[PDB]
């Protein structure tokens, strides 16, 4: 049933490599409309990271903007894939989850990896209750704490917060931070990517999982990418072109969603892990 489990593992690597470029071309970056988001530069993390105007979240007089794109892959579960809000972007970031109601957040990524700015933090830390953006102004949004908890063994930190914007009830979200994951990287642990995948599927919930990471497109889409390949899995509906199928759909979504033939590999290696295939044998980069 499944077609790449067979092959040696030089030839699985070989076959995921020359998938990936073929997944890579597939998308023309000069021919995508970027309207919206090129009209929001200001609010963009990164000059090259822009999200698909056709597929844009939230969907297009204020418009509240975060550099995202709605994923549905047709599963129990929508997602939000975007960056990591710049600040003056933070307002529509928080705005949306609580105009939206988002009720899970993932956040794949710390805010600075060595001294690298990735992120900015958007919920309040020890020992502050009350975090606004951007506190100076009339009309601004704030949110507060509602408890943390940290697993430090998977690095993941749980974060229950409450969002208040100005003329709206309280809204309460539920943001993960998993600091395991490095950019342009793969997860430093099976464990801590396995619990993320749980945390998804069990959660309920009538809004879309928003996932980000910094640029919101290498770990958030090779994450969003496992969760839609063990589904497939559970579905019995596993395919020789699952994974291929699952990211060039995620690619076609949104420009770049999974960046390294690595974190395709991780993909890959859900589901062979999954069906009780050994991994040792490619996990060896």
């Known amino acids: 049933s499944f077609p790449m489990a067979q092959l040696s593992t030089r030839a699985q690597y070989s076959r995921m490599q020359r998938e990936f470029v073929q997944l890579q071309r597939q998308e023309n970056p000069r021919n995508i409309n970027f309207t919206t988001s090129l009209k929001n530069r200001h609010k963009n993390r990164y000059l090259d990271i822009l999200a698909n105007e056709e597929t844009i979240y939230p969907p297009v007089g204020r418009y509240p903007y975060i550099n995202g794109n709605l994923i549905d892959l047709d599963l129990p579960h929508t997602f939000v894939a975007c960056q990591a809000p710049v600040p003056q972007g933070v307002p529509d ?45 009339h009309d601004a949004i704030k949110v507060t704490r509602d408890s943390y908890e940290v697993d430090a063994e998977l690095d993941i930190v749980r974060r229950p917060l409450v969002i208040h914007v100005p003329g709206k009830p309280m809204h309460r979200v539920l943001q993960v931070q998993y600091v395991g994951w490095p950019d342009h990287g793969v997860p430093e642990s099976a464990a801590s990517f396995d619990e993320l995948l749980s945390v998804i599927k069990n959660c309920v919930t009538t809004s879309p999982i928003l996932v980000h990471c910094s640029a919101g497109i290498g770990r958030t889409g090779t994450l969003i990418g496992a969760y839609a390949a063990l589904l497939h899995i559970e579905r019995g509906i596993l395919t020789d072109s699952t994974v291929y199928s699952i990211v060039a759909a995620m690619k076609q979504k949104r420009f770049g969603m999974v960046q390294r033939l690595e974190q395709y590999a991780v993909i890959y290696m859900t589901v062979l892990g999954r069906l009780g295939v050994d991994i040792s044998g490619l996990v060896s980069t």
Do not use: H, I, N
């Open 93 to 137: 970031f928080l705005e949306t989850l609580s105009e939206k109601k988002v009720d899970l957040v993932v956040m794949l990524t710390k805010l600075r990896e060595g001294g690298v700015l990735k992120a900015e933090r958007y919920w309040p830390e020890e020992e502050e209750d009350s975090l606004s953006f951007p506190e100076s102004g």
